[PDB]
Design an enzyme around this catalytic site. Structure first.
Site, PDB file in Angstrom:
ATOM      1  N   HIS A  46      27.709   9.922  12.143  1.00  0.00           N
ATOM      2  CA  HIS A  46      26.575  10.377  12.110  1.00  0.00           C
ATOM      3  C   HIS A  46      25.439   9.337  12.453  1.00  0.00           C
ATOM      4  CE1 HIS A  46      25.597   9.983   7.871  1.00  0.00           C
ATOM      5  NE2 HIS A  46      24.525   9.986   8.292  1.00  0.00           N
ATOM      6  N   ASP A  97      33.360  12.466   9.922  1.00  0.00           N
ATOM      7  CA  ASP A  97      32.305  11.542   9.806  1.00  0.00           C
ATOM      8  C   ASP A  97      32.777  10.084   9.502  1.00  0.00           C
ATOM      9  OD1 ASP A  97      29.756  10.635  10.173  1.00  0.00           O
ATOM     10  OD2 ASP A  97      28.952  11.359   8.252  1.00  0.00           O
ATOM     11  N   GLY A 196      19.888   6.569   4.197  1.00  0.00           N
ATOM     12  CA  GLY A 196      20.058   4.963   4.564  1.00  0.00           C
ATOM     13  C   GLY A 196      21.471   4.380   3.816  1.00  0.00           C
ATOM     14  N   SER A 198      24.292   5.940   4.172  1.00  0.00           N
ATOM     15  CA  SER A 198      25.289   6.439   4.908  1.00  0.00           C
ATOM     16  C   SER A 198      26.190   5.360   5.642  1.00  0.00           C
ATOM     17  CB  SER A 198      24.860   7.386   6.350  1.00  0.00           C
ATOM     18  OG  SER A 198      24.335   8.614   5.526  1.00  0.00           O
TER      19      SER A 198
HETATM   20  N1  LIG Z   1      23.544  12.126  -1.963  1.00  0.00           N
HETATM   21  C1  LIG Z   1      24.249  11.862  -0.506  1.00  0.00           C
HETATM   22  C2  LIG Z   1      23.874  11.655   0.688  1.00  0.00           C
HETATM   23  C3  LIG Z   1      22.533  12.325   0.889  1.00  0.00           C
HETATM   24  C4  LIG Z   1      21.915  12.171   1.842  1.00  0.00           C
HETATM   25  C5  LIG Z   1      22.504  11.438   3.015  1.00  0.00           C
HETATM   26  I1  LIG Z   1      21.314  11.145   5.026  1.00  0.00           I
HETATM   27  C6  LIG Z   1      23.753  10.808   2.710  1.00  0.00           C
HETATM   28  C7  LIG Z   1      24.214  10.835   1.580  1.00  0.00           C
END
Ligand SMILES: NCc1ccc(I)cc1
Length: 245
Positions: A46, A97, A196, A198
């Site tokens: 993603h 993902d 951020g 991710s």
């Molecule tokens: N708290 C898990 C999480 C929340 C938002 C994103 I963008 C990625 C991971």
């Protein structure tokens, strides 16, 4: 990372910091990743799906700060950007993902291990820790959901693995969570991954080995009651990883 603590790259030396070059020259942070072998960083699809061209990206290893050049760091172009062909997203959940970045310096080199640059072991197939196990997450993501800025200094925290059965409760995520995902959270919901983070590592100790158990993928908000962090379950993607590396 909401809550937790500041850290440096020595405490997570597989952590990769991934940035994008913009059309007018500017460079912005994208996502985290993990060095799984000298030429390969694993992250989340993603992070790249909107700008899927490998030439747009820069990867750093050995970097502890977002906008400062950490002594010993290495900088790479992306030789190959491999996104998972069965990726999907709906309003919340990302499926499959997972992404691989083959890294190559301007000198044509891969990562050179140092005190600040090391690989992380992959798990054995279908072999995860039991629910309630404490694991760590690392990233440059937001410190508060409402923040506009990312922290300049790397952070890490601890979260506990949640059973699929608990994560699939309607008041958690219902069927948005699949068997190819792992949920993790704090018992008080006070610490979590956030925007951020991710692509970055969820690391657990299995049989006295630090193991890349998960990849930060999605969640409803951050550090929110009944809304765990959701992670790509690496132990269910080993053939895909092996076949693409
Ligand atoms: N708290 C898990 C999480 C929340 C938002 C994103 I963008 C990625 C991971």
């Amino acid at each position: 990372i909401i809550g937790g603590e500041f850290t440096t790259i020595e405490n997570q030396p597989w952590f990769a910091a991934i940035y994008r070059r913009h059309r007018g020259g500017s460079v912005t942070y994208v996502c985290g990743g993990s060095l799984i072998s000298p030429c390969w960083v694993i992250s989340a699809t993603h992070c790249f799906i909107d700008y899927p061209k490998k030439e747009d990206y820069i990867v750093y290893l050995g970097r502890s700060r977002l906008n400062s050049n950490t002594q010993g760091e290495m900088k790479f172009e992306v030789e190959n950007l491999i996104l998972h062909k069965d990726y999907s997203a709906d309003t919340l959940a990302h499926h499959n993902d997972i992404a691989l970045l083959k890294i190559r310096s301007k000198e044509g080199r891969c990562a050179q291990p140092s005190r600040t640059i090391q690989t992380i072991a992959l798990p054995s197939m279908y072999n995860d820790p039991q629910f309630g196990t404490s694991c760590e997450i690392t990233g440059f993501g937001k410190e508060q959901s409402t923040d506009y800025l990312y922290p300049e200094q790397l952070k890490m925290t601890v979260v506990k693995l949640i059973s699929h059965r608990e994560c699939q409760q309607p008041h958690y995520y219902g069927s948005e969570v699949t068997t190819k995902m792992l949920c993790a959270a704090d018992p008080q919901w006070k610490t979590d991954s956030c925007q951020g983070d991710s692509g970055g590592p969820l690391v657990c100790s299995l049989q006295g080995r630090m193991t890349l158990t998960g990849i930060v993928s999605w969640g409803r908000g951050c550090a929110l009651k009944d809304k765990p962090g959701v992670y790509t379950r690496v132990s269910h993607f080993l053939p895909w990883i092996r076949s693409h590396t």
